[PDB]
Design a protein around this nucleic acid. Structure first.
Length: 86
RNA sequence: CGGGCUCAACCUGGGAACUGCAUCUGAUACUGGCAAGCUUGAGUCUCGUAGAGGGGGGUAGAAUUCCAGGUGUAGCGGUGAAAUGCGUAGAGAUCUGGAGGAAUACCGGUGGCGAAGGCGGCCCCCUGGACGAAGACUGACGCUCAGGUGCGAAAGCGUGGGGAGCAAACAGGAUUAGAUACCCUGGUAGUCCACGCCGUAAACGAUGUCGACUUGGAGGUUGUGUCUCGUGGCUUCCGGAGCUAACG
RNA sequence: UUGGGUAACACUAACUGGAGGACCGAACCGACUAAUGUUGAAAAAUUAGCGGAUGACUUGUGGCUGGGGGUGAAAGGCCAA
RNA sequence: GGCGUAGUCGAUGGGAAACAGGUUAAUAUUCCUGUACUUGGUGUGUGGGUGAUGGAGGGACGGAGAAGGCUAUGUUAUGC
RNA sequence: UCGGGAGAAGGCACGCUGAUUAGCUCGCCUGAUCAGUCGAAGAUACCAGCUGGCUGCAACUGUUUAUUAAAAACACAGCAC
RNA sequence: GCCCCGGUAAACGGCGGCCGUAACUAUAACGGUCCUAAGGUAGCGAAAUUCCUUGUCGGGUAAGUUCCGACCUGCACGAAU
């Protein structure tokens, strides 16, 4: 994942200015990384190592979302709607 | 504690502590719940660093063997010593050429890296971790972590391929009182490649991880610095206090 | 295929789909045990049972290969009773 | 007596064209009645180009599962 | 070989009659409810697995003596030279 | 081409006998001694492939030359005969 490709995805999801660590922001990076990793599965069916690496990349997201929907349900439906998870 | 049956066991009277639970009231520092709010943490960001870290493909040289040619002697090979064996239609030794398989000098190191297993002839691609500086960011989003999940030498196993060398089992020659050992001549699986599986081990530094704290000296790897020295991380040795049954 | 748990590997539930020289069978196929029959129509049939049953199946017509032959998943089996 | 080319032969399969009705002691989508259709030849008219052999659709429309439409008939109706 | 084995096994109900409910557009379609009631027997008249255990052999379907043996015989995918 | 030597047993095959140690007795087990080189350890074995053998121990049964398990010197069982 390129630098600008990461700094741009954080801005489009950033709640406010300079927003780097947020529920909707974090999940954004994770989702992205997951998309690239999942696509990495379509090929190299042998890469069992990186396979494990996703269990967490998502367990974090699945936990962040669980935390989001738990506190604010509005920010939830909006987040998923923007990304496209579930 | 006192008293009663001659004592005691036993028993009586009184007293105290008396947990636990119900009711009412109060405090509320700490834990919990709700609401709001700061950076020196963790993580992250920016700029840099060392390395045999992992996966795929390609590639070089030396050596062993086989095949072809030349030459060529009478032996060569091999051992503690020999023999089997190979050789005058020409082995060995030697030169040239070709094919194939496996692992890969000087540098390598007492070095370095990876989470571990492991990983260095070299090159490229893909990908994990960690360290230093600026101290900027989120703003504590931390640490650990039953279960779960993945990884995990070698050996061995399934299918296909390959197979130079080496080599369990195995076929012989020696040694020996006997050797179904060591030594020697052959030799299958395997050792190798692709894929699937097993999941174990001195998987050992045999001292799980994280943070704080406690004299220093010396050698080495790496970043930075006002670099005959200061400082951060890593790898050894000797050691203060202290710790240990002892070794340490 | 859908839904759910999971990162994935995959798993579970439901649904769909329905293969399989598979099982029961219409028509029928095969045919172990006995009796009848045994100068039966004659070149081997009847009865009571019994077993297996969409395929490498069954069948009509036409055509091809012949004797020491061919053929034969070899039984010395078959090649016009 | 046998192996390639040109020709031909080989399955009432393939194969251009009609049904309905009536009639005989015995026959028929062949007789009769009505109607339809095909091929070949010629031409009155319309119309104003008439063609082996290989190749095209076509005939090889094959196997398995199956929806829907659907006939007369039958039936509900003891309707006509 | 989780495909299966399994209509395993085992047990109950299953008649008629009256009045109704549900599914569907409807059926002279289907699934049920309540009450009454007769026989020894209600799938009372048309088919039709008996079940279970141990052991020998071959794997199985299939093939084989058209006229006495289909059997542990033959073949078969697979493995090897 | 063959005699020559060597390789090959998924080549036709061969695998007898004896003593000691040791047990209450018999056998198995181990080594040797001899013959013809080895003499058999995986499994499993008197098994449809062993005479002797209705072999020995035993299950099971009132009893079973049947069968199953074990031992097993394997007359003339044993490796894709």
């Amino acid at each position: 994942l390129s630098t600008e490709a990461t700094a741009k995805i954080v801005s489009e999801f950033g709640r406010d200015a300079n927003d780097t660590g947020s529920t909707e922001v974090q999940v954004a990076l994770l989702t992205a990384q997951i998309n690239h990793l999942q696509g990495h599965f379509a090929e190299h069916k042998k890469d069992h190592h990186s396979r494990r690496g996703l269990l967490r990349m998502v367990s974090q997201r699945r936990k962040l979302l669980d935390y989001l929907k738990r506190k604010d349900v509005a920010r939830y439906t909006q987040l998923i709607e923007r990304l496209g998870l579930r």
